[PDB]
Ligand binder design. Structure first.
Ligand SMILES: O=C(O)[C@H]1C[C@@H]1c1ccccn1
Lengths: 276, 274, 278, 280
């Protein structure tokens, strides 16, 4: 409570992630909308329109966002980050916690750019995902060289208000991107395809969408609340000779498992490329 | 207020009882379940919950008003023969067995007493965490209050809606078998996380939380799942690269294949029952 | 009601793209054909005979095109561009706007070449496609170092008369090449195959070509005029259990989607190699 | 224009996607007043029904009211509902009606068999159209039934041409048309979503990639319709030696791109034939 009581948050970038976080934070009750500020070069964006309706102060100047924020989220594409650290770098102060959300961008790279201005910049690296908008995000963070003990603690409480959150070593964050960072996109693909199959077999599309989504939600919650291995839960619900085991067979015949492994791998490797 | 019985005491009976009593809609002590093999792990878990257990299907009928049939589909004919003479005006018979049509249940129960009140439903195991997906069709002699009662009960443990009976085999392929597709996906995503360096326990948690939040996002937006995929794929980024490798494998067609195969197998099991 | 009275346009090159643009510009009414000049080392091309019928002035000499023109389109193969710039570089004046349509050729390389002759050449890079010929092209452009503000607005005005036109950062043009630059060829291949499919199921070839093209035209127009996701429009057409969803499944089973992603990717990456061969 | 002053009353049995697309197209074309259209559905909770309401279309749950209102009556329900529909309103079909069946696969013979038990000479037309009529760029074929007057086919062609291409065919081509242009817009929506994904993968904003892909497909289709040339010739004309386009065409060929579209037309046509055989 005392963490967020006298806390101001700014977003460099008013894109998809910034709206999701701002929307998650306000819905959780941790931050008030008017106490949040975002800067965007293009105010013609859709997210920039939705954020204004929320009551989020918007500005074109990143230097304005830096001046009126304590915790500063960097929610821009990785290639813009060094151009932004050169723009607002002289405005970073001792009180700023800089939370980097750009994929791939290492703590070392941010600290190197900001250490040329003030010596001990407090930096945290973050991999979250869009379901923070419904407070069911998956977030990890690593603390940088000069982050104080309370800084990790403040970050953990804030990000926990909108989903799962835990600290990791920074070298795991590329892998987390490929799993839970890109994860929701795999799920949306899967739901579109599952609804298509429902439609093929005679269901109205709207019902097929709803039923597929409820199935995934329930199965994930079930796994999260179980002590049990995913395979054991698969085994429990697969009756001998039944419909479900017949469907699992056709998933196995297309190498379904290898495609998800391929996906996690390809997103992680792309994240490593964007750093280098 | 109401008395509920379970013929069968396996995965589905435990999942519904646990969900119902966790929802606060049923008291565990007003639930009775019957099983032949009184040594299944599910039979022990139902005891630890407060549920009254028995080996006589006839005692479960005499105890309950709402009667769930949660046995394998090939046992349903034999159960309707054993207790058919014990069904009264008061009973609502709710069949959860996959494929088993309302017609076949009504024909068997009508030889003992006309106008049996029958409901067919397709549900799934996540009712155990109150996040099931349930559809139901009302039989010939189900009164209106029967279907409204069933929707109130089953809504307390997940999504529930009424459908025409000829959709239920498709629903089986989609949300009936759906959780198993998700467990397969979660096992594979976790293997991917581990290959890229994550501890298994962390990778299982992150993969499960991702699927949960994605599903909730879609349930709470007006938006097409393709649109949400568009919203989360930045140009040139890690996600769109991973989506490409899913597409190159025909990821979408495999899930369509799955729904189709489960629905078709469901229809075969009803046919061999005819 | 657009018309550029004080503007004279020249094309260096007289192949597919120069004809398509000149045909589009003259059909749109924005340019009289006699105010357009084109040059080609092969004055016996099929497109060259077509341009002469429209009334377009033709000449073998690239210096003549430059000396007659204000807006100068470079509509030649990418590896021809450096030799062109060597040839006409000393003829470029302050009045010239050089619009390069060559795939992959960067603004930087054109400006470096032309700056040897006269400082501050006004350069615009353009990625367009052949449907400008029926005034339904897809065009993006990026403005160069010394291109004035009035230069980009002028090119957007002209290119908008023959289809969609918008300004982009130069580093998106390779990717636009992969999508809308090469896109019409993907569509032609698709329409050939769809027609084959109609013929297999018993349609006359002429009807099947007509119906397939009309289907693609109407679907693209639906998407352009709708605020909706293409997945949602797909959803509205597929009746439960119906013929369409059965066909979508066999598309999905062959990985239809990934092949189009593969295509955009391959065209873009090849475009980058040609920009590095420069 | 000449059709508008005919002051035709039009009915749709079914108020789904195709009924909305056609009603929207006819009203945009100015050939029909929205309030001169009546549509019926057993489910008034459909989004298409609410859109129809907003347009000014008359809505009723009673198919008989739609029939009594109509001069030209469109059957736009799923193919397996048609026989139940003809049983219900067959007695209300009058000599003045033109019955236009849009149901995929449903033959003129089966409709005439049902309706002829009531009046002797039902005027029946079978048509295959598609959802781009909503932007007046539909693809429509129709076949005239046993008792359709020569004027009935001409009126149909006039009406359907106001919302896109329209031509008369023998009925035995209509299953194949269904697999090509009936299902075709969905093949294109899939292609456009994928092409956009490819644009985004190579660095384009989604909004721009969607716009460019759609514009490309529209321009290419128009090019072909206005050309007297083979699609392969247009492909040849635009693929420069060693260029980016010919490289991309190779990777399409290596995945069997052409065969997937042939497979699709075939599968939709074959499914359409099964929807009729399951009826009969
Ligand atoms: O829904 C489908 O699968 C399409 C085959 C049917 C259709 C009917 C009428 C007009 C256009 N398409």
């Amino acid at each position: 409570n005392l963490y967020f009581q006298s806390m101001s948050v700014g977003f460099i970038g008013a894109g998809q992630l910034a709206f999701a976080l701002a929307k998650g934070f306000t819905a959780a009750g941790v931050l008030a909308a008017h106490k949040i500020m975002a800067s965007s070069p293009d105010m013609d964006l859709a997210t920039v329109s939705a954020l204004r309706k929320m009551g989020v102060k918007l500005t074109p100047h990143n230097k304005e966002t830096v001046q009126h924020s304590d915790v500063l989220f960097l929610a821009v594409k990785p290639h813009i980050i060094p151009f932004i650290l050169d723009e607002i770098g002289a405005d970073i102060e001792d009180r700023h916690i800089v939370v980097s959300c750009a994929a791939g961008v290492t703590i070392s790279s941010i600290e190197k750019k900001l250490s040329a201005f003030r010596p001990a910049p407090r930096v945290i690296r973050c991999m979250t995902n869009t379901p923070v908008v419904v407070r069911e995000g998956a977030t990890v963070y690593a603390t940088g060289t000069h982050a104080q003990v309370e800084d990790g603690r403040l970050m953990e409480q804030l990000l926990s208000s909108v989903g799962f959150c835990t600290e990791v070593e920074e070298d795991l964050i590329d892998a987390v991107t490929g799993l839970s960072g890109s994860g929701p996109a795999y799920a949306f693909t899967a739901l579109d395809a599952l609804a298509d199959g429902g439609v093929k077999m005679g269901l109205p599309r709207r019902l097929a969408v709803r039923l597929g989504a409820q199935a995934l939600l329930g199965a994930a919650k079930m796994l999260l609340h179980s002590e049990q291995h995913p395979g054991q839960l698969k085994d429990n619900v697969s009756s001998p000779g039944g419909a479900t085991i017949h469907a699992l067979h056709v998933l196995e015949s297309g190498g379904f498992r290898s495609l998800l492994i391929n996906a996690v791998e390809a997103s992680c490797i792309r994240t490593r490329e964007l750093q280098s």
